[PDB]
């Protein structure tokens, strides 16, 4: 009914061979920056990462549901490591079902979720669902405050699906890291510490923890004096 | 505002302007009259006013006052651009406690002969009142620059009629003015 501890933006991007998703490590408690080690990117197998924003208690509930789903998928399934592994699309559809059912019981999971992955055919998967069950896909996805600031920057790289094959992992990762820096400049509930995950159809999941926003520019602040007339 | 209903549209053509309005006066769903013309003129400047009919009447009487005093002092009729500024300042003088109206100015400047419309100087077409969004759709589909006055008449008339047909609170006939520097023709349209 009301979110208490909250994560903030998850941002993500397709690139030629995969998907990148990043989220910062902060649990805020209103304006109090209370918890600073909250991982909000949940890998599911080697082919999927779930990025969660919003209520951290509901996030922990979803993470439990995802671990249970992997366990259940392994039951009586000798190919659970192979052609009957969970796909990103299965995980997304399950989460979207849960979210919409919870909404329809007036008891929402107060989250926005991005499922990033690579399908077994090598297709990039990147889809959003929120607490309403509203779903959409785009070559770039961002939740929360990142929807307003990160998406413009990432779309300057990937404006349409025909930009995806032109976009390397280096360019996409640089764009994601710069967008995280911009969020640290401009989101009062952000952290300079973030996690980033790369899901490549060739090189698999690479999950980078304890990244820090670097190369911030602040020295121009020395010149700012008063609010108008103070010399 | 919507209590009374009503729509005004103006369009520029080649050396011409058109301004058109519906004639309905309502009181919510009750139709009161079909003789409530929303288009006034002050010399060669035409003003359409949509919105609350008491404010339409009050503002017409006020702009008559102001443009008569203007002609007496200046010894010339007011031009459309000057009248647009006058309307703007007169409405903002009630920025708190507004008149609930949408003015549309149309005319031709006596000296340059340039057609002018405002609601700015958005030169193609200007739309006001309850069917504004239907009118935007119609005009943005039908409008072409540099229409001759007869084609301008057809275009604005079809925009008004088809937009009005999808507005419950406006209609029961329409009037179209086609304005040229030498000549103004009023036409009445049947609505069905």
């Amino acid at each position: 009914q009301q979110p208490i501890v909250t994560g903030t933006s998850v941002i993500s991007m397709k690139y030629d061979n995969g998907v990148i998703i990043a989220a910062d490590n902060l649990g805020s408690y209103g304006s109090l920056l209370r918890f600073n080690g909250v991982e909000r990117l949940i890998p599911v197998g080697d082919n999927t990462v779930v990025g969660i924003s919003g209520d951290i208690s509901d996030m922990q509930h979803i993470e439990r549901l995802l671990k249970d789903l992997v366990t259940e998928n392994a039951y009586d399934n000798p190919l659970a490591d192979a052609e009957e592994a969970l796909e990103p699309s299965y995980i997304f559809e399950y989460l979207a079902t849960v979210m919409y059912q919870r909404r329809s019981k007036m008891n929402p999971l107060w989250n926005a979720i991005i499922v990033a992955g690579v399908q077994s055919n090598g297709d990039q998967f990147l889809r959003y669902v929120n607490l309403l069950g509203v779903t959409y896909s785009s070559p770039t996805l961002a939740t929360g405050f990142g929807a307003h600031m990160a998406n413009p920057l990432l779309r300057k790289v990937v404006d349409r699906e025909s930009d995806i094959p032109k976009t390397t992992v280096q360019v996409a990762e640089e764009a994601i890291v710069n967008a995280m820096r911009v969020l640290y400049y401009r989101d009062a509930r952000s952290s300079r510490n973030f996690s980033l995950a790369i899901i490549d159809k060739n090189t698999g999941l690479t999950f980078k923890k304890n990244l820090q926003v670097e190369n911030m520019k602040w020295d121009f602040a020395k010149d700012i004096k008063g609010y108008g007339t103070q010399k | 505002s919507s209590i009374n209903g009503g729509i005004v549209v103006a369009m520029t053509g080649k050396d011409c302007v058109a301004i058109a309005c519906d004639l309905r006066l309502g009181s919510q769903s009750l139709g009161v009259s079909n003789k409530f013309e929303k288009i006034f003129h002050y010399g060669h400047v035409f003003l359409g006013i949509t919105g609350l009919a008491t404010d339409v009447t009050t503002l017409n009487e006020m702009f008559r006052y102001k443009t008569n005093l203007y002609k007496l002092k200046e010894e010339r009729a007011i031009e459309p651009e000057t009248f647009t500024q006058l309307v703007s300042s007169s409405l903002y003088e009630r920025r708190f406690g507004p008149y609930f109206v949408g003015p549309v100015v149309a005319g031709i400047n006596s000296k340059s002969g340039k057609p002018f419309i405002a609601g700015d100087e958005a030169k193609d077409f200007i739309v006001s009142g309850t069917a504004s969004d239907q009118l935007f759709g119609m005009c943005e589909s039908l409008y072409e620059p540099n229409l001759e006055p007869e084609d301008l008449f057809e275009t604005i008339s079809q925009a008004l009629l088809n937009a009005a047909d999808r507005d419950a609170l406006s209609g029961w006939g329409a009037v179209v003015y086609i304005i040229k520097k030498d000549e103004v023709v009023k036409r009445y349209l049947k609505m069905r």
Binding site: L153, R186, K225, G228 | Y92, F96, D120, Y177
Partner: protein, 220 residues
């Protein structure tokens, strides 16, 4: 609306989009949002257009009168102070959010003013519904040593981010460039990225499709 201001090594740029909206409806595709307070002092407003227009007109009038009284070029700090005090008097009921930029004998200046009368100075600023997208561009590309051409490029890129990503912003980019020691360079429709494609057919009706009841000439 997207408005930005960008200071550069010898001046300041302000830029705006040109879409005016009435709710979800585009009332005007090419509204001029950059308003001259004085020859080298320019403002741009978000919020309700009429309040921006009116406060700009009043302040410009008083600035011109004050310049005549003092026999001096007007100062951006005077426009700021007068706007600030007017808006504070009206306690935020004047819904004007402004970027004020200009050049004066004391140099280049760039300020934002909020409807409550709060002001700040900046090297780069954005306002309106597209302000977050524009600021994302500004934060990723602004630098202290911008030339004029870099600052124009940056400002128009930030407006373009607003145009593409904010529904409330669109159509063209207007720019005004105020260099120190130079005339202000107003660049109406500096970019036109949103030109409508030609329709599939002409919709000109044949003469007489409309039924006319009666005609009369009006005396004027």
């Amino acid at each position: 609306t997207t408005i930005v201001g960008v200071k550069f090594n010898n001046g300041v740029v302000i830029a705006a989009d040109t879409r005016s909206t009435q709710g979800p409806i585009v009332a005007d595709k090419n509204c001029a949002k950059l308003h001259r307070i004085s020859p080298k002092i320019w403002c741009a407003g978000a919020g309700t257009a009429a309040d921006t227009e009116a406060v700009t007109q009043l302040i410009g009038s008083n600035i011109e009168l004050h310049s005549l009284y003092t026999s001096r070029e007007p100062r951006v700090v005077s426009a700021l102070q007068m706007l600030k005090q007017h808006l504070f008097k009206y306690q935020g009921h004047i819904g004007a959010y402004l970027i004020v930029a200009g050049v004066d004998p004391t140099g280049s200046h760039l300020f934002s003013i909020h409807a409550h009368g709060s002001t700040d100075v900046g090297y780069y600023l954005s306002l309106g519904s597209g302000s977050l997208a524009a600021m994302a561009v500004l934060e990723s590309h602004w630098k202290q040593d911008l030339t004029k051409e870099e600052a124009i490029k940056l400002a128009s890129d930030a407006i373009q981010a607003g145009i593409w990503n904010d529904l409330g912003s669109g159509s063209n980019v207007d720019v005004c460039v105020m260099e120190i020691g130079k005339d202000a360079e107003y660049l109406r429709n500096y970019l036109t990225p949103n030109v409508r494609e030609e329709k599939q057919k002409s919709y000109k009706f044949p003469r007489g499709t409309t039924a006319v009841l009666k005609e009369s000439i009006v005396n004027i």
